Amino acid sequence: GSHSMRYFHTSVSRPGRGEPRFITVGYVDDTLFVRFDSDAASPREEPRAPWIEQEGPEYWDRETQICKAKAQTDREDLRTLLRYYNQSEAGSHTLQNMYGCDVGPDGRLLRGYHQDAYDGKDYIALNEDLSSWTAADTAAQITQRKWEAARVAEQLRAYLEGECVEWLRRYLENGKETLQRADPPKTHVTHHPISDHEATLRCWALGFYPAEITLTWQRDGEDQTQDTELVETRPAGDRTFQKWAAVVVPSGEEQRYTCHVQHEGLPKPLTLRWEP
C-alpha cells in the first residue's frame, strides 16, 4: 500500500556538561534504517537495516556530513531560542525536528512534512501546501518572517517532491523482502479470575508488522470503548509489535464478549472469543 519516510532529530542542551547532545534516526514505515549520535566515539551515520548496507561510501560520507552540519545549526538555534523566549543560559532545553514524505501505492507523493518543536511544544510547521507556515507563537513568528524572506519553503518543497519520493522508491525496492511484507498478528484470548464475581478477558495481538492495528471488545455487539484497557502498541525487538485490550467481565458473561482485530496483514477482520 502506502509508505512513508521520516527523519527524526533531537538536540538537548546540558550547560556545564559540554555541548548539546544530537541524536537523529531515519525510518521507512516502522523500520529503523539509519542512526547518528554526536556522543558516539567517532560519530558517523550508521546502518540499521540490511537493505541500506549496500549504499556505497559516497552515501555514508554525504549523510554523515549532513548530520554533523545539522548538529551544529541546532546548537546555534538553541542559543537563538534562549533569546526569543527571554530564558537563562542555566537550564537544559530541547529542539526537535521531523521531516519526510508519504507516498501512495503508485509511488506518488501524498503529502510532505517539515516541523519543529522547542521544549516539547509545537514551534513552527510547514503546511500541507509545502508553501506556507503555521507558527505557534510570537517567537516562531520571528522565524516565520526570516524563512519567508529567504524562501525556505521553496527549498523544502523541492526536496519533499523530488529527492524524498525518489529515495523512498529506491529503499522500497531494495528492501522489498521486508518493507513490502505485512506480518499478521498472532491472536488469542486469556482469562484472569479477579474475584468470585468477575474476571479479566485479555485479547492479544502478537508478532505483527506494521505497527498500525485495531483491537476492540464488544458485548452483545456493542463497543466497550470506555470499559476497555488498551495498552500502547509496543516493540517486541524482532521488528514486530505487540498489543492487548482487556475488559472486566462478570461471572458467566464471557460468551457475550467478542474481540475484533483489524490489521493490513489480515485479508478479513478477525473475531475471537474466550475458549475454555
Binding site: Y7, Y59, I66, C67, Y84, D116, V152, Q155, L156, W167
Partner: peptide, 9 residues
C-alpha cells in the same frame, strides 16, 4: 537520503 539544506531559526 536526507535534506541538505541548512536552515536556522
Amino acid at each position: 537520503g536526507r535534506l541538505n539544506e541548512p536552515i536556522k531559526v
